[PDB]
C-alpha cells in the first residue's frame, strides 16, 4: 500500500431502481442473522421484471482503482427463470485493455456450507483515464463500493499464528 481506501462508485440508492437490490443470503450472516457482502450488490427484477443493463464508469479521482464483480451460477433453473427470466446468460465486462464475456448455465454441485449454488468472482485493476463498462442479461454481482488506491512497493504478506 502507498494509498488505499474505500469509496462508493455506485450507491445502492439510485443506481438500480429498475432491479430489486435488497436480497441477501443466510450463510452470509452476522451474529446469526443473514447478510451479504458490504461492497457489492445482488440485482433481481421488479416483481419478476428483469430489464437488461448497460452501465459504466471512468475515473475522475486520478488515482488507481480496484474493482470486483461476480457471475451467477444457480444450482437449479427455477431460480434462473424466476429471477432473471432468461435461460441465456450473457454478460460483457469491458475495458480498453481487459475485456471478457460470461455465458454460464446451471451446474449442480454438492452442498458446501449448505450451498450447491455458486457465484464465480472476477476482478481487475482500472487506471486513471480508462473506462469500465458492464453489460448484462442478469446473473451478476455488481459493485456498491470500490477500492481507491495508489500503488505501494515492497511490503507484502505473512501467514502467522504468533
Amino acid at each position, epitope marked *: 500500500v502507498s494509498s488505499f481506501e474505500r469509496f462508493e462508485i455506485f450507491p445502492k440508492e439510485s443506481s438500480w431502481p429498475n432491479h430489486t437490490t435488497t436480497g441477501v*443470503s*443466510a450463510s452470509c450472516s452476522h451474529n446469526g*442473522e*443473514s447478510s*451479504f457482502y458490504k461492497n457489492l450488490l*445482488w440485482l*433481481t427484477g421488479k416483481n*419478476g421484471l428483469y430489464p437488461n443493463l448497460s452501465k459504466s464508469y471512468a475515473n475522475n479521482k486520478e488515482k488507481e482503482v480496484l474493482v470486483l464483480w461476480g457471475v451467477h451460477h444457480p444450482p437449479n433453473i*427455477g431460480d434462473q427463470r424466476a429471477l432473471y427470466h432468461t435461460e441465456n446468460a450473457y454478460v460483457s465486462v469491458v475495458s480498453s485493455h481487459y475485456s471478457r464475456k460470461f455465458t454460464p448455465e446451471i451446474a449442480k454441485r454438492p452442498k458446501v456450507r449448505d450451498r450447491e449454488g455458486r457465484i464465480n468472482y472476477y476482478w481487475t485493476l482500472l487506471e486513471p483515464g480508462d473506462t469500465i463498462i458492464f453489460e448484462a442479461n442478469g446473473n451478476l454481482i455488481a459493485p456498491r463500493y470500490a477500492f481507491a488506491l495508489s500503488r505501494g512497493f515492497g511490503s507484502g504478506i505473512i501467514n502467522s499464528n504468533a
Partner: single-chain antibody
Amino acid sequence: EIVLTQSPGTLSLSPGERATLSCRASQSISGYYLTWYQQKPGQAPRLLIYGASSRATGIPDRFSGSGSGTDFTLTISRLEPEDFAVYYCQQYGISPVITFGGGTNVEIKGVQLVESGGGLVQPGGSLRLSCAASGFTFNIYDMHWVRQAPGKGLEWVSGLTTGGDTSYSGSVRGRFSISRENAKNSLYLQMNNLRAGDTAAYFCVRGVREVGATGGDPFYYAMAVWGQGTTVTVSS
C-alpha cells in the same frame, strides 16, 4: 403501502358456476406482486394463486385469474360447496409492507409452525408471544406476524427480513417489538401498551426465500406457509 379494495366481500352463488373477484388498488402496481388465498373459518389459510395468473402446488385447475396494473383479478371456473370460504388478496409493497384485502366470502347456495401464548391481558398491559418451527430451516425465510378480527378484514401487523430491515405499520410500531432466533428455530414478539384494537386472532407466517440456499424449495413473492394462529385479547 397502498390501500386495496376487494370486489365483493361476500357473494352467494350456485354450483356449476364461475366466480369473478376483482382486487384493485389505489396505484398501478406491476403484477408478480400479489398472491391469493382461501380460508375456512376454523382452519388456517391455504395458498392458491400468485402474480395474477399462476397457480400453486397441490391443486385442481379451476381457480384462474387475470388483470394487471391497478386492477388485479382472480376468477373461478367452477363453484362447489367444498369451496365455502373467505378468499384473500395479499401484496408485497415495494415499501416492504404486506397489504391485505378484506376477505371475500363465497357462500354456496343449495413442515409446520406452532404458536405460543395466546390469551388475555388487561388493556394498557404487556404480554409476549412466541412461535416455534418444525422440519425446515428458519434461517432462510422472511417472516411475518399478521392479525385478523372475527369475520373482518385482516391487518398486517409486522414482518422482518432475515438481514434486519423491519417493517411495521405506523400505528402499531413501537408498541410491538420482535426478535428472531435461527439457531433456536423460533421467533418472539414482545408487546406492550395494548388496547382493544389488538383484540383479535393473530398468525405467525413464513414468507420469502431471501436469495440463496440449497433446496428443492423454489420461491415466489407469495407466502410460503401459515400457522394455525391464536386468540389474543384485552379485557377487565
